[PDB]
Design a protein around this ligand. Structure first.
Ligand SMILES: Nc1ncnc2c1ncn2[C@@H]1O[C@H](COP(=O)(O)OP(=O)(O)O)[C@@H](O)[C@H]1O
Ligand SMILES: Nc1ncnc2c1ncn2[C@@H]1O[C@H](COP(=O)(O)OP(=O)(O)O)[C@@H](O)[C@H]1O
Ligand SMILES: Nc1ncnc2c1ncn2[C@@H]1O[C@H](COP(=O)(O)OP(=O)(O)O)[C@@H](O)[C@H]1O
Ligand SMILES: Nc1ncnc2c1ncn2[C@@H]1O[C@H](COP(=O)(O)OP(=O)(O)O)[C@@H](O)[C@H]1O
Ligand SMILES: Nc1ncnc2c1ncn2[C@@H]1O[C@H](COP(=O)(O)OP(=O)(O)O)[C@@H](O)[C@H]1O
Ligand SMILES: [Mg+2]
Ligand SMILES: [Mg+2]
Ligand SMILES: [Mg+2]
Ligand SMILES: [Mg+2]
Ligand SMILES: [Mg+2]
Ligand SMILES: [Mg+2]
Ligand SMILES: [Mg+2]
Ligand SMILES: [Mg+2]
Ligand SMILES: [Mg+2]
Ligand SMILES: [Mg+2]
Lengths: 372, 372, 372, 372, 372
C-alpha cells in the first residue's frame, strides 16, 4: 500500500532537523528532464545567503543519465531562473528553478521557457494574466488509487464532490500540508477542493503575470511530489488513470488582458473566442506532450467533457470546451475559461500558444519562426 | 475497522502545520446538500483578515454534481450568512456558512433559512429562546458500531448510561476534542453525556435567540464530522441504527418566551401545549426530512418513547410527547420540552413550525399564506 | 488484550487539547449509582470560574437508567458536596462530587454521607483521623490479568513484592500517571507500592479529619478509572480475582483520636480494641456492600488473612484481625489498623460504624436511630 | 470471513466417519418453526432400517423454545410425512420431514400442508404439475456477500450472468456439492445456473405432481443449509439483500394441467390467465410470509421486474407478471410461468392459491371454509 | 483459541495408523480419581485378544499423584469391571473400566459402584430401567465458549435451540464424530440435539438395566473427552459456566420398573412420586459431588428450572421438579422424569438413591447399613 521508507521512525528525523544550522546555506536545483514531464534535483552548499536570483552560480549535470545527450559530450548546463523559500528546511535555505542548455550554449529540446519569455516581452505592454486548475489522483504503491478497496471499487459517484467525512474524502492530510507549504514558500495558491471521483483533488494557482505562471506551477507540482514522498504515496497526472465510468483529469486555464479587464470587455472576449475558433487542431496539438494521443483517452464527449474534434462555446455550459462565467457575462467584464488542455500539459507551451493565437493574430499550422 | 487515511503518520502533518503562515488568510465555505441532510465545503484565499460577515465576497459551485441542477444551467450561488473561528487552522483563519440560490436568484428547494428568518423578524418582540439536544452513534468503516465485538454484541443495557471505564465508554477522545474545538470556534455548546447504548453520545446547544439556533447547530455538526474524519471513524444521525432491543436517537427541543420566563409562566405554557395538542400530524410531517417515514422506526411506545399516533403531556413524565421539568412546575416559570423530532431533523423547519403553531395562532394542514 | 479505543492516534488528541479555551469553564458532576459500587458522570459549562463549592447550581438526572427509580417519576436531584481541580483538562476547570436525593427531597437508598456527616459533627471535638490503603488488580480486556501469559501463569510468588524489573512489575506507567494526577488535583495521596501477586498494586490516602475520608477516596477511585480508560485497561476491586494460591485484595483502615496520639495513648487504644471485640458480626456486615458474601472468598486464614468469624489482636501480627505497629507499641502512642474490610467497601459506612462503636457507646444488632 | 468451525481439521472427521456402523440406524426429523421461514432438526436411533414412511414412530418437542406455545403446555407433536436417503451419513440412514400439531391435536398456526393436501386431493383428476425456480445469495459471517471486496463493490453488472472464470463466478463448489447431494438423496432437481449479481445462484425443482412439490422444495432448502454450514458460509433468501442498482431474488413458478399439456391447450392457458387476472391483490398477499411488505422492496419495475400495483401478461415479455414461452406459443400447448412470488415464499400457500383460483373458480377475498 | 497440538499435521498420523498391527493387542484402563469427577487412563500390551472381561489381569498405580494416598503407602489396585471396543485404534483393541481399592483391599472413598452393585442385586427381580440426558458446553483454550465473538456475546436466545446453519450451530463435527464413535464402541446412545445456548449440546444414553447405566455413561464421557482432545477444544460439565441470562446444564434422569411398564402403571408411578416428595433435602445432597453447592447456582426458578428449596410435580410441566410425559399421561403406563440432578453428578449415587427411596421404603437422613 505505502512505501517502505514511510515505515521508518520520523521522530528521529525531527530530532536531527531540530539542530542549529550555522553560517552556511543549502540550495536545491530543479530542472525538467528529457521525457518532457519528469523532474530532477540536486543540492549544494553556499557560503552566504543570496538576496536575489542573479547572484548565485551556474552548474552542470550528466546528460547521458537523463536521455538528453550522448556519452561523448554528456555535459549539460544549468542556469538559474527563479528562486523561492524552502519549506522542508526553513530559512535561510532556498529552492532554485533552472534552465537547461547544450554544450554549445544552445537551448535543449525540452526547453520552452526560452521562447516563451521572448514572446512575452513583446506583449508586456498589455501584460495579460493567467490562472490554471491542476487536478491529480493519489495512488498507492501497488498501482491502485489510495484508499480504494483492495481489487475493488467504492460506491457510485454523486456524494464525493466537495465531500466531508471518513467515507467521502481520502487523503486530506496531504492536501493540508501542501497548502501550508505553498503558502510558506511563496507560491500564490488560490484554493482547493475535492473532485467527483474519490481520491481525486484539485488546486488552483493565480492570477499570474506573464512568464511567472509557468514557474509557479512547476514549483507547486515539485512541492506536491516531495510532500507525497514524505507521506509514502504517489501523485499522478495521467488524464485517464482508471478506465470506465470514472472522471478524468484536466488543467483548465483562465485568461484575460487589460482591455477585457476594463469596462465593456465582453466584446474583446468575444473577438478572441472567434479568433480561437479557427485553430482547433493546432491548439489540440500544442496542449499535449505526446501530440494529443494522451488527451484522446479523456475527451470523449461525456463526464463533463467535450469531443476531441468539436469546437463550441457558451455561457455557463460546462461541456462547450469554452465557457463564460455567468457573473462575468452579467457584469460585462472579466475573463473566460478554456477547458481542452490535459492534466500533464506544459504551461509554457499552452500559454505561448494562447498568446500567439489571440494577440499576434498569426495563422497557419506552424508557428511564425521569429519576431524582433 | 478504521480508514486507511488514519494509518498515516501524523507527526509529519504536525511539523508541516507548525510553519508560520504569512499575510494571507484561508476561508472555508459550507452549505447544505440537495438531499436535505448532507454537507459540502471548499476553501479559498483572501488578502486580509475580515472582521465581519458582510465584508467578504460571494461565490458559486457546480450544481450538477450535488443533485440540484443540470449541466446547461448547473451554476448556483453561495451567499455568506454567519462566521466563526477555524479550530483546525487557528487564527486568523475563518469558516463561513452560506445560503444557496439558483441561477434566477431564487431560494433553492432545500433552502428554508430564508422564510425562517423572515418570520423570526416579525415574531422578534417576544424574544424566543431555543435549546436542542443532538444524539449520534459512532461507526467503523465496516458498518458496525465502533468498539463493538467483531460480528457480535456487548452485554445488555443498564451499565452504559453516563458510565466511566474502558468497558463502559467507547470513543471519549472524539468527544473531548469535539467539545474543546467547539469552545474555541465559538459555538454555544452547553454540555455532553453518554447514552443508553454503548458508543452513543449526546451534546446540547443553547440557549440562543431566534435564527442563530440553526446555524449554531449546523456548524456543530460540521465540526463533529471533521473531527471524526481526522480520527478515522464515521458519525451517523440515523434514528434507528441497530434493530432490536437497542435505543434510538432523537433531537429533543426546548422552547421559551419572555412572558413564560418573567413570571407566572405556567399560564402561557399550558395554553401553548393545548394549542400544540391539535396539530399532531402537521408537526410530525414537519419534523422529518422525508415526511416522517424515518421516524416511524424509532417511535414505538417503549424504550422511553411515545407512540407515533398518540399525543400526551405531563410533568416529569419521560414517556409522553411533551414534558415539563419538575423544577419548572414547582417555581411556576421556565420552559417545556418537545421529544418528537428525530435525530436527522432540520432545525430551521423545526423552529419555524413551533413558532407558527404557538405564537401565530395558525391552524390547518397547509403552510400559511406568504406573509405569516 | 487492550481496548479498541486505545489503538487510536493520541497525537491528534494532544493537538486538539493544545488550543486556548476562552472565558467559559467546564464542570464534571460525579455520583454513586444504585448498585452501591458504580460511578457515573456528566459535564456542563459555566459562565465564570467558581471560588467555592457553595457557588455551584444543583442538577438532575434520569433515575430509571441508573436503576434507582421508575420512568413515571425517574427524575432525581444532584447537590454538590466537594470540589477539586481537573487534571485531565487543567485549570480553570473543575470536577465536583455530589450526593443524590429522591423526588421527595430526601436521601436515596445508597446515600450514606447524609447520616455520616451528621454523626461526624456530633463528635468533631475529639478530632478523629482516618487512613486507608486501597489495592486493586489491572486486567486486560479479555478477562485475564494484564501482562500475564496468554492462558498461563507466571512463576510462583516470592519475587514480585516491591519488584523493580521488567519481569517483576507489570504496568508502572499507570501508577506513575495516577500518582501525579492525584497530586495535581489535590487528593491527600501518601504513597504506593507493588503487591504480592504480579499486576497487583496499592496506594495510600490520609490522614484526614472527619467526613473528608470518603470524598478523597471516592475521587481517587474516579481518577484511577479515568487514567486506566486512557491507557485502555480495566481496574477491578474484586476481593478475589484469581482463585487458587494467589493473594486477595483488601482495604485496611487506620484510626486515631485526639485522646490517643498523646502521651501514653496506648491505654485508650487498648480500651477501644477491647470495646470493638464485642461487635464482630455487626462490623463484618457493615464492611461489605452485599452483607459479607464477597469478603467470604478472601478471609480464609491463609495468605496473611484471618478467619471470617474469629477475632484476634496482637502487636506486629499481620495474621491477626487487629494490628498495632511496633513503633506505636514502643512509643505508647499512635494508631491501630483494622484488617477486616474488603477492597470494594464503602468508606462512609465503614467510618460511621467505627466511630459508633469506639467514640459513641452502642450495642446490639441495629444502629441507634434517634441521631446518635 | 468464514465461521470459526470451518477452520477445524476435516481429515479427523473423515477418519471417524470411515468407521463401520453396525446394525443400528439413525433418523433425522425436520420441521418448520413459528416464524414460518425457519427449520429445526434432531436425531434418533432406530433398531432396524424402515422401508416406508409408515413404519416410523411419532415424537415431540418443546414448543416454548421455538415460540410456538407456552411453558405450561409446551409439548407439541411430530407426524412423519416423507422420507429420503441421507447424503451426509449415507445409507442406511434416513431423512424425515414432519408436520406439527398442538397438544390438543389441532394443526399448528404455521402448518399449511394439512389444508394443502385436502385441496390437492379434491382435484386429483387433472394431474397438475408444478415447477419452481429458487434464487439465493451467499454471505460471509461479517454480513457482506461472499467474495466481495472488503467494504467495497465489484465491477458493474453484465459479465456475471452464466459466467465462468475466477473473476466472474464466486463459490461454485457449494453449488456442485448441493447438486450431487440432492441427486443422491432423491430430490427432483432439474438444473442450475449463475445469476446477474455476483455470488447469486439459482436451482430448479420439478416437474412434481400435487403435494410432493412442497416436500421436495423444503428438503432441498434444508440440504443447501447443511452444505453451506459445512463450508462455513451463510445462505440467505432475502428478496433484496443489497440496496441500489443490484438484482433481487424471486421464486417464479411454472404450472400446467393435463388439458394444457394436450394438443390445443393454449385456449385453456389463456382462459386460466384471464380468470387469474382478477385476484391480483389476493395473490400478492398470499405470496408473502408476512403479508407483502417484503416483496414491496423488490417489485418496482426495474431490473426485469414488474410493478407491484399492476398486472400484465405477454409471450416473450420478461418484464410482465405472467409469461408464456415462445416454444409453447408456437406449439400451441405446454405451460405458463408466474414471476410474482418472492424468494422466501411458502410453496404450500403458492400452490394452494393457484389451484383455488384457476381450477376451483373461487372468488372474493377470504378462502372458502370447507371442501374448496 | 485452539490448542497448539491441534495445529500439527494430521496426515502423518493417519499414515502411521495404517500399518498392519500384528499379533499383539493394546488395552487401555480407565478409572475415577480422588476429586470424584476426573478421569485417568493408561495402556498396556497383551499377547492375545481377550473374549470376556474376566480374562484381563489386575494392575496398580501410584495414588500419591492422584491425591488418593500418601507417599509411603501409595500403591492402589485396579480391578476390571467392563469391556468395550476401541474406536480410536479399531479392532481388536479394547477399552477397560476398573474399580479402585486401597492397599488393604477395600473400596476407596470415591468408589461407589461397590455399594450400588449390591443394592441393585437386592432388587434385581423388579428389572428397573434408567435413562439419562447429558448436557455440556464446548470451550476454547482461552476460557470463552467456542465460536463466541472475542470478548462479546452472540444475539439473544431463541434461534439456537435445535438450530441449523453456520450462524446458529457451533461445532457439529465434534457431535457427529462422537456419535459414530459411540455406535462403533457399543454404547447405547439414543440421540442428540442442540440446546438453547449456542455451543451447548446434549446426548441421551439408555434405556439400560441395573448397574450398566453408570458404566455406559462413564465410557461415553471418556469418549467425548478424547474426541474433543483430537479437535483441540475442551468440554466442560459445569452447571453454570456463563452467569447472566443464559441457560444452565442438567442431567435429567428417567426411571421405570416392570410394574410401571405393564398396564395401569400410573398408580405405581404416582405412589413413587408421593414417596419421593418427602426426601427433598436428602436427594439434593446426594445429587451433587460437593453437597449441593454447585447446583445452587443453577436452580433459581426461571429458565425452565425449579427452585432449590421447593418440591413440585405435574404433567407436561417443564418448570416442576418432577414431570410425567404427556404420552404417558394419555396412556396408563411408562416412565417419569426427574430434573433435579446437576450436569457433573455421579450416576452410581443417583441410581442408588432413587432405588433406596422408591423400592426399599427407606427414611431418615442417613443410608441404611448392610442389606438395605
Ligand atoms: N481576471 C482574471 N484573469 C485570469 N484569471 C482569473 C481572473 N479572475 C480569476 N481568475 C482565476 O480563475 C480561477 C478560478 O477557478 P475555479 O474557482 O476552479 O473556477 P471553476 O471551478 O468555476 O472552474 C482562479 O484560479 C483564478 O486565479
Ligand atoms: N430558559 C430556557 N429557554 C430555552 N431553553 C433552555 C432554557 N434553559 C435551559 N434551556 C436548554 O435546555 C437544555 C437542557 O437539556 P438537557 O439537560 O440535556 O435535558 P434533559 O435533562 O432532558 O436531558 C439545554 O440545552 C439548554 O440550552
Ligand atoms: N495518626 C494516624 N492516624 C490515622 N492514620 C494514620 C496515622 N499515621 C499514619 N496513618 C496512616 O496509616 C496508613 C497506612 O500506612 P502503610 O504505609 O500502609 O503501613 P503498612 O503498610 O505497614 O500498614 C497511611 O496511609 C497513613 O496515612
Ligand atoms: N410441462 C410442464 N409443466 C410444469 N412445469 C414444467 C413443465 N415443463 C417444464 N417445467 C418447469 O419449467 C422450469 C423451467 O426452468 P428455467 O429454464 O430455469 O426457466 P426460465 O427459462 O424462465 O429460466 C423447470 O423448473 C421445469 O420444472
Ligand atoms: N420405558 C422407559 N424406561 C426408562 N427410560 C426411558 C423409557 N423410554 C424412554 N426412556 C428414556 O427417555 C430418554 C429420552 O428423553 P428425551 O427425548 O430427552 O425427552 P425430553 O428431551 O423431552 O426430556 C432416553 O434417554 C431414554 O432412556
Ligand atoms: Mg475549479
Ligand atoms: Mg473550471
Ligand atoms: Mg439531555
Ligand atoms: Mg431531554
Ligand atoms: Mg500499607
Ligand atoms: Mg498495613
Ligand atoms: Mg430460470
Ligand atoms: Mg423463469
Ligand atoms: Mg431431551
Ligand atoms: Mg428431559
Amino acid at each position: 500500500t505505502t512505501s517502505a521508507s514511510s515505515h521508518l521512525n520520523k521522530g528521529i528525523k525531527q530530532v536531527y532537523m531540530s539542530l542549529p544550522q550555522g553560517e552556511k546555506v543549502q540550495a536545491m536545483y530543479i530542472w525538467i528532464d528529457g521525457t518532457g514531464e519528469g523532474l530532477r534535483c540536486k543540492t549544494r552548499t553556499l557560503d552566504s545567503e543570496p538576496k536575489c536570483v542573479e547572484e548565485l552560480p551556474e552548474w552542470n549535470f550528466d546528460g547521458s543519465s537523463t536521455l538528453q545527450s550522448e556519452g561523448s559530450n554528456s555535459d549539460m548546463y544549468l542556469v538559474p531562473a527563479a528562486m523561492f523559500r524552502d519549506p522542508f528546511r526553513k530559512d535561510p535555505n532556498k529552492l532554485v528553478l533552472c534552465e537547461v542548455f547544450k554544450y554549445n550554449r544552445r537551448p535543449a529540446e525540452t526547453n520552452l521557457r526560452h521562447t516563451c519569455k521572448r514572446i512575452m516581452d513583446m506583449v508586456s505592454n498589455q501584460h495579460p494574466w493567467f490562472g490554471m486548475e491542476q487536478e491529480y489522483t493519489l495512488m498507492g504503491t501497488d498501482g491502485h488509487p489510495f484508499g480504494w478497496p483492495s481489487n475493488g471499487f467504492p460506491g457510485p459517484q454523486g456524494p464525493y464532490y466537495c465531500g466531508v467525512g471518513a467515507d467521502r474524502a481520502y487523503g486530506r492530510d496531504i492536501v493540508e500540508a501542501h497548502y501550508r507549504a505553498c503558502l510558506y514558500a511563496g507560491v500564490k495558491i488560490a484554493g482547493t477542493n475535492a473532485e467527483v471521483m474519490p481520491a481525486q483533488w484539485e488546486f488552483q494557482i493565480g492570477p499570474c503575470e506573464g512568464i511567472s505562471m509557468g514557474d509557479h506551477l512547476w514549483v507547486a507540482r515539485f512541492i506536491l511530489h516531495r510532500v507525497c514522498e514524505d507521506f509514502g504515496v504517489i501523485a499522478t497526472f495521467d488524464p485517464k488513470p482508471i478506465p470506465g465510468n470514472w472522471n478524468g483529469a484536466g488543467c483548465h486555464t483562465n485568461f484575460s488582458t487589460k482591455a477585457m479587464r476594463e469596462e465593456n470587455g465582453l466584446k474583446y472576449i468575444e473577438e478572441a473566442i472567434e479568433k480561437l475558433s479557427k485553430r482547433h487542431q493546432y491548439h489540440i496539438r500544442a496542449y499535449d506532450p505526446k501530440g494529443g494521443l494522451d488527451n484522446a483517452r479523456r475527451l470523449t464527449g461525456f463526464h463533463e467533457t467535450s469531443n476531441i474534434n468539436d469546437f463550441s462555446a457558451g455561457v455557463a455550459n460546462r461541456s462547450a470546451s469554452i465557457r463564460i462565467p455567468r457573473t462575468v457575462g452579467q457584469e460585462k467584464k472579466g475573463y473566460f475559461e478554456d477547458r481542452r488542455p490535459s492534466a500533464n500539459c506544459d504551461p509554457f507551451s499552452v500559454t505561448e500558444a494562447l498568446i500567439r493565437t489571440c494577440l499576434l493574430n498569426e495563422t497557419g499550422d506552424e508557428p511564425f519562426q521569429y519576431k524582433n
